[PDB]
Amino acid sequence: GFVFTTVKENPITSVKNQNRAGTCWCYSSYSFLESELLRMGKGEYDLSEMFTVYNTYLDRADAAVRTHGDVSFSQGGSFYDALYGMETFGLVPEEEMRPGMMYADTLSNHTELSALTDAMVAAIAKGKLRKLQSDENNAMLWKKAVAAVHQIYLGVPPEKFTYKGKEYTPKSFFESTGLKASDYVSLTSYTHHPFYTQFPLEIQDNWRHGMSYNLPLDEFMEVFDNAINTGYTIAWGSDVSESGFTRDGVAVMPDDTKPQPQKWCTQAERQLAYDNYETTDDHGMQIYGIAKDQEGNEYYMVKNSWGTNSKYNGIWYASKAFVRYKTMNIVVHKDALPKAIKAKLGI
Amino acid sequence: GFVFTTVKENPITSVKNQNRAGTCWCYSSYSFLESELLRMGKGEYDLSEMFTVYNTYLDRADAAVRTHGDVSFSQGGSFYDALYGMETFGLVPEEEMRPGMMYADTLSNHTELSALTDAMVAAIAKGKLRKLQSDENNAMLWKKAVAAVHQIYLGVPPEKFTYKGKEYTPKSFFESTGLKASDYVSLTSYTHHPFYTQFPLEIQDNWRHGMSYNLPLDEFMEVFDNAINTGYTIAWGSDVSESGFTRDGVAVMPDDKLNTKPQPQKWCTQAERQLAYDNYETTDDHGMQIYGIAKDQEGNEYYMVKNSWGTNSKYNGIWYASKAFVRYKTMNIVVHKDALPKAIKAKLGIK
Amino acid sequence: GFVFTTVKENPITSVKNQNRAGTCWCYSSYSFLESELLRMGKGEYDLSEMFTVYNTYLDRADAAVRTHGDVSFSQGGSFYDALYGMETFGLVPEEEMRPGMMYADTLSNHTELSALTDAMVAAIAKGKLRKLQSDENNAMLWKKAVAAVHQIYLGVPPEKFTYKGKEYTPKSFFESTGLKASDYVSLTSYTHHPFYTQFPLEIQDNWRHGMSYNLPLDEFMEVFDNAINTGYTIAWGSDVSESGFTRDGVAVMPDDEKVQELSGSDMAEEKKLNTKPQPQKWCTQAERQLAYDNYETTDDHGMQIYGIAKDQEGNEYYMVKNSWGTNSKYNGIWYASKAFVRYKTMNIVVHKDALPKAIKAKLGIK
Amino acid sequence: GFVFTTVKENPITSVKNQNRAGTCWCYSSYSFLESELLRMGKGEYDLSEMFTVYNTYLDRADAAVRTHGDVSFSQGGSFYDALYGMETFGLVPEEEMRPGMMYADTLSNHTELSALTDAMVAAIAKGKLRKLQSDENNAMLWKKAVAAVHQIYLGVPPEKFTYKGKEYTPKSFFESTGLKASDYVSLTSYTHHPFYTQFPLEIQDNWRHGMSYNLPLDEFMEVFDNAINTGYTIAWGSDVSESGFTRDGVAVMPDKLNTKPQPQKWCTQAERQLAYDNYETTDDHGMQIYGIAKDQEGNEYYMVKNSWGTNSKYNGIWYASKAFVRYKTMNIVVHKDALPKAIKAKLGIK
Amino acid sequence: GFVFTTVKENPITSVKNQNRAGTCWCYSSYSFLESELLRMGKGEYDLSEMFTVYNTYLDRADAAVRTHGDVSFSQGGSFYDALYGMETFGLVPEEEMRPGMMYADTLSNHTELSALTDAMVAAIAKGKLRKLQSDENNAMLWKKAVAAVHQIYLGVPPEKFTYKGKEYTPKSFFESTGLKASDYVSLTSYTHHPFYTQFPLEIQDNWRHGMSYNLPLDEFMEVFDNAINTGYTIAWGSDVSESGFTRDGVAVMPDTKPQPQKWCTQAERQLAYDNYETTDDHGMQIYGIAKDQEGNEYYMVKNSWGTNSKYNGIWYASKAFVRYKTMNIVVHKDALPKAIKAKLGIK
Ligand SMILES: *CC(=O)[C@H](CC#C)NC(=O)CN
Ligand SMILES: *CC(=O)[C@H](CC#C)NC(=O)CN
Ligand SMILES: *CC(=O)[C@H](CC#C)NC(=O)CN
Ligand SMILES: *CC(=O)[C@H](CC#C)NC(=O)CN
Ligand SMILES: C#CC[C@H](NC(=O)CN)C(C)=O
Ligand SMILES: [K+]
Ligand SMILES: [K+]
Ligand SMILES: [K+]
Ligand SMILES: [K+]
Ligand SMILES: [K+]
Ligand SMILES: [K+]
Ligand SMILES: [K+]
Ligand SMILES: [K+]
Ligand SMILES: [K+]
Ligand SMILES: [K+]
Known part of the structure; x- marks a missing residue:
């Protein structure tokens, strides 16, 4: 079996459960x-995932309709x-918009919501309508319909709420927190783009076309350990549809239940798996620590969103x-980058 | 050409326009x-058609979902x-729910509303969902979604309103009218059911399975003249997808300038009428109102028909359909009971 | 395990087998x-199921064509x-139309018959034909084709036959039996219609739109015991797509929370939910309505309830005669908990005289 | 009828013919x-349109495969x-890749080429393959197949060629011209993004997600006249699925609609935005505006060079009303220096 | 269990592996x-299967396009x-065209090649194109495309080559071997055609409409034993979608151990062909006759699925x-009994 010992770990929150929804990204x-x-x-x-999930789906429907169904x-x-x-959109606390609250449950189940909204967006984006209807204020009626259905299954977003003694709006609550998206950068490692440049990853969920800095594979992995050792956590989006992730x-990459010698990939071998569909944007998690096995092989400690009903209560060990x-x-805070890598990117 | 002379005509309302919607029935x-x-x-x-059209579509969506897509x-x-x-549901006046008011128009255009709601109902009735979601009051969530989309395109139903100085609800406003659905009967004439019995017409728009009294063809046409001559109007449902309907x-049925001048008409048998219904030549196409009788130059008889296609026609939205x-x-x-002849009414078991 | 003891059961016939066909209703x-x-x-x-199955499909095809494919x-x-x-149509005995007689079998297998007739009806009801052909007597040709294919797979309906020494027609043999459809009523229990009224159940197989009397759930279950205790049987149409139906x-309706409470394990095959008597979930009228509204209760299977029995622990069960043959634990007999x-x-569906007098007065049956 | 008189026009090339293909953009x-x-x-x-058209389709096929069919x-x-x-990819002259040269024609007809390549990309991007094959150099085999089919219908890209006495490669011939993509900016006018910012236009053919500067409608039209009056031409992408475009x-916008000068509908910024939101304005056609002309009544028109050949009333030239x-x-798309100096400061282009 | 004893067997080559392609026929x-x-x-x-497989698919694509998609x-x-x-087309040796040579493998995997070429042929044969393009020499462009894609996945056919000391062409290498297709006949046994006549079997893979001699079932089985006893092998095309084929x-037909086998009549064999119970599934080679422990007869069959099976890729099919x-x-003429051979008119 496996016996892990923590080398360093950073503070995290309780493990949540996305349940029946593709909301792992949030x-x-x-x-x-x-x-x-x-x-x-x-x-x-x-923080309320359902609030951002609601507003993101509204924007994705607009992207699908504007591109006539190209954006899935x-x-x-x-x-x-x-x-x-x-x-x-801002931020709201979890209690304001709770998952499953609208169908008398406590966890997410968006199968019926998807069944309706997918058919609605497709009827507009991929239909034969030649002029979409609008009211006297030039507001699109189909956007009202898609938003109304989303509210019935996810809830109504609050415009004002009281949290811990203070009355907030979704934007002032975001300013209350003091986070700012400018301080966070996305990083990747591929060869179909020049290194130390920015490009949007050609994946379906990147319909916003957010950019990522391209780093060599060895320098890319240097940011992982530096982020954990500096006091930072890592938003980890990776492929989990492999035999090694159980x-x-x-999550191991063995060189063909116990520690085995691992296969360390080349930059080209990593590129081929991305080229031949073997590496896809499947799951989003958080890396918050480093651990070792009995034989000393390294591991990253990963916090999942599948509940606490697992051997390590919702914590997974992904080998380096x-x-x-x-x-x-x-995605990591820019300050988690090593100074040399950070200078190479032009920050 | 045609020159019509009115024999008898009964009071009607102004001609309305259904426009781009299949709401001729309402x-x-x-x-x-x-x-x-x-x-x-x-x-x-x-009376507001959009109010009844809104509530009927909500019931039709329920019928489609309950029958897993069988009811179209x-x-x-x-x-x-x-x-x-x-x-x-009751009745509300036209001003409380006007056509097109929600998309900056004055007449109905339900193509986009249909495109969305058809896809929604199909995703539920014909999908692979095995358990539909509900709230803590056992209310179906998909019914809320279908109703919400209908309100965005048709308007919000009023629960109370003021009409001519008095505050009404849709139920209380219907009671003002004093009409009763029990006082109206549906009549048809076919042979795939016994005469003088009741059966539901096997047509897609009869998903409520409302029944109709079956009469012989000659007695069936007797109700037309008796209703008009005694002062009643007729809700008329007929197939208009013929070369004779212009x-x-x-609307003529000439025997072989077939549609421009009066010609000798083909008077179908009960069997010929049955075949056209059996072989798809007679379908439930259009709903109108018959309110009068007119004659041509050669004495052939016509029914004066009030259509719902506006007034931009030769007779300002009025059609002359030959008998x-x-x-x-x-x-x-559909006519009032008292519009039927007493002998025909006794054969059907009415009171 | 289960040990059942009969309290009262009424005479039934031998258990038959529908086999590979959706003919449980007949x-x-x-x-x-x-x-x-x-x-x-x-x-x-x-009685010959294949005779009625043949004639019903002919009427169902006509309903599908008349409604342009709405009736499935x-x-x-x-x-x-x-x-x-x-x-x-009348009634004919089993020997005049047996299942599988046309493809060298003894049991039904209508997969190929359905594959052909479904495509035929769809080509007419859902096609682009604008005028269906007919002969000089105004008889529809497509009806002849659908009937001809049905006879090739099910057999030719007899117009006359000899049974136990007497010559019959399907109509005259039905009159011999003395049954009358007026003596039988359909009963249901739902809230989307007023109680003590008649409405046609909004299910696909009710394309004839036959009516059912609506009763409150407690009064509805009163007809079950009264019919069995007075000597009548019940035509039982029910949902069988549940984990409890084995x-x-x-066929049980176990309460998961109580079984896991009586279990030694916490909330976090071995559960033994359906293998022994367990505390049952006694649904409310609203819980029953929700399952019908959210697709959890569907018109799946038709059976016959003919008796009442109890287990070792005294719980009540209805004795159910299925049509799946006798190769089961109770030789084609199911025990369904109340x-x-x-x-x-x-x-x-029960005889009118199986209803209690008070229930019969509330519905207006004479 | 119409009688147009030119006010100012800038030098253009001969009118070409895209024919069957949807290559108006190139x-x-x-x-x-x-x-x-x-x-x-x-x-x-x-310049050879087929050379850029060939290489663009390979990039679009790769984008469709990478996005699993999302990019059309x-x-x-x-x-x-x-x-x-x-x-x-560079530039090559027309003589090195000619349209229709591979199927014994002189103009483009890409209906059969599309029928094959669309089915090929869909079998990869939208199929059930879970691992795409590659050779010993990690080169994708499907990319070789898609490129091979494109070469059979469009021609083989030259690796070296001689033009006017000197030997070139596609990269070296582009450097000879001295053009630079940095000297060209894309401009639009919409309100679903802040003005004087950059955003990618949400149209299917912008799968590269190229950015455009957002200007108010009045300042947007100021770039049109300033570009023509200073000596520049305009790459004009517009909707042509209107009754006014004959x-x-x-190409008129009437309030005999398109046969004589009539009063025009002067759209607002909101009216223009609604047409883009409700599908009435779509990315249909790409043309070139190179001049300004008169009505009899003084109304302004842009002189448009189309790519539909010269068999028209004005030999392939359109008059689009302002x-x-x-x-x-x-x-x-215009050169930077075609922008007014003030507009350049608002957008931050140096 | 089974213990088989060989009665007579003829020389064969090693068993090969088709791996993942439907190339069992070749x-x-x-x-x-x-x-x-x-x-x-x-x-x-x-001999190189990939060479013949390449050219056969080119002819099958032409057949599908000419019949507007009728030929699958x-x-x-x-x-x-x-x-x-x-x-x-001729013959070339194996090492000049190997399976998997083009996608860094050693065995065949034609799933991606089929996915592309099926879509290509369908776009032409079943599309709405009303005039297919051609070059100046009247050569079809779609044939160039289908051939080019086939070469990318299967390899380039050699036009000249050296084998064992001499340079050959596909003509000349086939002539070197000295085989002649006229010396080979196809045989079947069915009743929907008159006996001792020729008809093309109504199966999808017989799109060339090659003929077969029709024999009574008993005389059909006489050719099996006569071929083995005289020194010939048999190209055996048969249905393998049965429970008896393990x-x-x-491969038994019971009425893990020897059991009494069911002896079908000519009508029972015909019914299985009429009702889809006997389909053209697999092609193999019969090269011998054997007995089990209990003396009932078996045919020794050489498969093409590799050698990782109980009998190293060789099957025993009961008579x-x-x-x-x-x-x-398919057998050589001289493998037929003389009496049958006159009835068919082969001389
Ligand atoms: C006339 C109309 O609008 C409507 C359209 C349909 C179907 N016709 C009917 O409802 C007739 N049953
Ligand atoms: C039980 C049965 O055979 C049939 C299957 C189907 C469809 N079910 C019904 O008829 C439901 N009453
Ligand atoms: C104008 C043209 O040929 C093309 C149509 C297609 C496909 N349009 C564009 O490329 C720009 N939308
Ligand atoms: C045996 C085989 O691979 C192939 C199946 C496919 C595809 N069968 C034949 O080629 C002859 N039936
Ligand atoms: C839908 C779906 C799958 C989904 N994946 C993503 O969102 C992309 N990171 C998820 C987290 O479950
Ligand atoms: K949270
Ligand atoms: K993978
Ligand atoms: K009205
Ligand atoms: K008609
Ligand atoms: K029976
Ligand atoms: K169920
Ligand atoms: K050019
Ligand atoms: K347009
Ligand atoms: K070989
Ligand atoms: K088989």
Whole structure:
């Protein structure tokens, strides 16, 4: 079996449960940002995923309709969706917009909401309508319909609320927190773009076309350990549809249940897996620590959003070889970058 | 050409325009009900079609979902939809729900509303969902979604309103009128059911399965003249997808300038009428109101028909349908009980 | 395990097998009608399901074509299909139309018949034909084709036949039995219609739009015990797509919270939910309505309830005669707990005289 | 009828014919780029549309495969496709890749090529393959197949060629011209983004997500006249699916609608925004505006060089009224120095 | 269990692996042709299946386009495809075109090649194009495209080559071997055609409409034993979608151990062909006769699925199974009994 020993770990919040929704991008983004609030001495927070998920879907439907169905309308998203959301829509506390509250449950189940909204967006974006209807204020009626259905299944967004003695608006609550999206950068490592440049990752959930800095694979992994050792956490978006990532919580990349010698990939081998569909933008998580196994092979400690009903109560151990091979992109505070890597990027 | 002379005509309301919506069933039903209110000395009314159209679509979506997509969800309907609707939902005046008010228009255009709601109902009724979501009051969430989208395109139903100095609810306003759906019967003439019995017409827009009394074809046409001659109007449902039905205001069934001048008409048998209904040649296309009788130069008889396509036609929205066309292409009719002849009424078991 | 002891059960016929066909509505209707003939002192009968199944599909194809595909064309049906069928088409004995006789079998297998007829009806009802062809007597040609294909797979309906020494027609044989469709009523229990009224159940196999009397749930279950205790059987249409409905011959509605409370384990095969008697979930009228509204209770299967039995622990069960053959634990007999029947029943059909007098007065039956 | 009198017009090249293909984006871009070369004193060029069209489709096929079918694979494109293409793939003259040369024709007909390549990309991008094959050098095999089919219908890209006495490569020939994509900016006018900012236009053919500067509608129209009056031409992307846009060579926005001068509908910023939101203004056609003309009644028109050949009333030249351009323009591309100095400060272009 | 004892067997080559492609028709055809060369004193050969598979698909695409999609375009084939192919395209040795050579493998995997070419052929044969493009020499452009894609996944056909000391062309290498397709006949046994006549089997992979001689079932089985006893091997095309066909290396027709087999009549064999119970599934080579422990007869069958099976890729098919599930066979003339051979008129 596996016996792990923590080398260094940073403060995180309680593990949440996305349940039946493709909202891992928002649950992991807020797990990362909540660790940022603890790190900045602002206390522990429980930010509402459903608030940003609601507003993001409204924007994605607009993107799908404007591109006549080119932008797919689905439950997925990115870390930039939350970074854009906090500046554009703001933030609200979890209690204001609770998951499943509208269908008498406590966890998310968006299968029926998707079934209706997918059909609605497709009827507009991929239909034969030649003129979309609007009211006397030039407001689109289909946007009202899509927003109304989303509110019935996710809830009504509050315009004002009281939280811990203070009355807030979604934007003033975001300013209350003091986070700012300008202080966070997205990082990747691929060869179909020049190094030390910015490009938007060609993945379906990046319909906002958020940019990422391109780093060499070895310098890319240097940011991982530097972020943990400096007191930072990592928003980790990676492929988890591999034989090495199991249910138990161990994500390894063995060289073909126990520690085995791992296969350390080249920059070209990593590129081919991204080129041949073997590495896809599947899951978003948070890396908050480093650990070792019995044989000394390294691991990153990962906080998932699948509840606490696992061997390590919702904490997974991803080997450094697995992270080097299957990572799609990461988001960390710019200050977590090493000074040399940070100068190379033109920050 | 045609030169018509009125034999008898009964009071009707102004001609309305259904426009870009399949709501002819409601506009003709309210044209019939408004003439009924005039007939009983209650005055002129302008009832809101969009109110009944809104509530009917909500029920039709429920029928489609309960039957897992068997009941088609479309814009059509029947006269019974309005008779059932006034007793269940009530009535509101036109000013409380106007057509097109929600998309900066004055007439209906339900193409975008249909495109959304059809996709919504299909995602539920014909999808792969095995358990539909509900709140803590056991209210279906999909019904809230379908109702919300309908309100965005058709308007919000009023719960109370002021009309001519008095505050009403849709239920209390219907009671003002004094009409009763029990006092109206649906009549048809086919042979795939026994005569003088009741059966629901097997047409898509009869998803409520409202029943109709079956009469022989000759006795069926007797109700037409008896209703008009005694002072009643007829809610008329007929197939208008024939070469004889023209945009010039006339609807003839000529025997072989077939549609421009009066010609000898083909008077169908009961079997010939049955075949056209069996072989798709007679379908539930259009709903109108028959309110009068007219003659041509050569003495052939016509029914004066009030359409719902506006007034931009040869006779300002009025069609002249020959009795031969009406005998052949009528799907069903709805009249007050007292418009039937006493002998025919006794055969059907009415009181 | 389960140990059942009969409290009261009424005479039934042998258990039949529908096999590979969605004809449970007819087999259960005839299990009910055969029990009615035994109760009325008419003897044992073996009514031909394939005769009624043939004629019902012809009417269902006509409904699909007339409604331009709105009425779905499938193998299902209702109890009213048999009640309407015996008055319209009549009855013939089993030996005159046996299942599988046309493809060298003894049991039904209508997969190929459905594959052809579904495509035929759809080509007419959902096609782009604007005028269907007819002969010089105004008879529809597509109806001849659909009937011809049905006869090739099900057999030719007899116009005359000899049964036990006498020559019959399907109509005259039905009159011999002395049954009358007027003596049977359909009952249901839902809230989307007023109680003590009649409405047609909004289910696909009710394309004939037969009516059912609406009763409160407690009064609805009163007809079950009163019919069995007075000597009548019940045509039972119910949902069987539940975890409690097992292939072992039991149909239960266990309360998961209580079973896990009585379990030694916390809330976080071995649960034994359906293998032994457990505390049942006694649904409310609203809980029953929600399951019908949210697709959790659907018109799946038609069976016959003919008796009442209790287990070792005294819980009540309805004895159910299925149409899946006798290769089961109780040889084709199921024990359905009253909680399951109260929760998952779509509708039932019983003789009028099986109703309590008070329930009969509230509905207006004479 | 119409009788137009020119006010000012700038040098253009001969009118070409895109024919069957939906390559208007490349033909109009090269009409614009050829006018830029004349303006900068480099002479006339006849740039190969098929060379850039070939390389653009391979990039679009890769984008469709990477996004699992989200990026649509079709014949369309944008002006940025040519600006990116000349810097990435370079430029070759028309004689090195001619239209229709591979199927014994002289004009483009890409209906069969699209039928094959659309099915190929869809089988990869939207199929059920879970691992795409590659050779020993990690080169994707499907990319070889898509490129091979494109070469069979469009021609083989030259690796070296001789033009006017000197041997060139596609990269070296582009450097000879002296063009730079940095000297060209994309401009639009919409309100769903802040003014004087950059955003990618949400149209299918902008799959590269090229940015455009957002200007108020009145300042947007100021760039049109300033560019023409100072000697520049405009790459004009606009909606042509209107009743006012006729095949006779006129494009009007009437309030005999398109046969005589009539009062025009002067759209607001909101009216222009609504048409873009409700599908009434779509990225349909790319053309080049190179001059200004008169009505009999003094109304203003932009002289437009189309890419539909010369078999029209004005031999492939359109007159677009200033009201039509104000209402139906999606975006334009001009040299930076065609912008007024004040507008350049608001956008921050140096 | 089973214990088999060989009665008589003929020389064969090693078992090969088709791996992941429907090229069993060519691998078995060349197993038959290689055994044909051994009996004729010509030595051992390894003919390239990928060469014939490449050219056969080019002809099948032309057949699909000419019949506007009626002829299906798939990976399957027949024994006549190889007999026609060797006379039309010739023969090349294996190492000049190897499976997987183009995608860094050693065995075939044509799933991606099929996904592309199927879509290409369908776009032409079943599309709405009303005039297909051609060059100046009247050569079809779509044929160039389909051929180019096939070469990218299967390899470039050699036009000249050196083998064993001499330079050959596909003409000349086929002539070197000395085989002639006229010396090979296809045989079947059905009643929907008159006996002792020729008809093309109504199966999808017989799109070339190659003919087969129709024999009564008992005389059909006489050719099996006569071929083995006289020194010939049999190209065996048969249905393998039965419960009796196991991955353990035996093919029985029971009425793991020897059991009494069911002896089908001519009508029972015909019904299975009429009601889809016997379909053209697999092509193999019969090269011998064997007994089990209990003395009932078996045919020794050489498969093309590699050698990781209980009998190292070789199956034992009972004579009752072959009598029931055989679609057609190909043998040399002289493998036929003399009495049957006059009835068919072959001289
Ligand atoms: C006349 C109309 O609008 C409507 C359209 C349909 C279907 N027709 C009917 O409802 C007739 N049943
Ligand atoms: C039980 C059965 O055979 C049939 C299957 C189908 C469809 N179900 C019904 O008829 C439901 N009453
Ligand atoms: C104008 C043209 O050919 C093309 C249409 C297609 C495909 N349009 C564009 O490329 C710009 N939208
Ligand atoms: C045996 C095989 O691979 C192939 C199936 C496919 C595809 N079968 C044939 O080629 C002849 N039936
Ligand atoms: C829908 C869906 C899958 C989904 N993936 C993403 O959102 C992309 N990171 C998820 C977190 O479950
Ligand atoms: K949270
Ligand atoms: K993967
Ligand atoms: K009205
Ligand atoms: K008609
Ligand atoms: K029976
Ligand atoms: K169920
Ligand atoms: K050019
Ligand atoms: K337009
Ligand atoms: K070989
Ligand atoms: K088989």
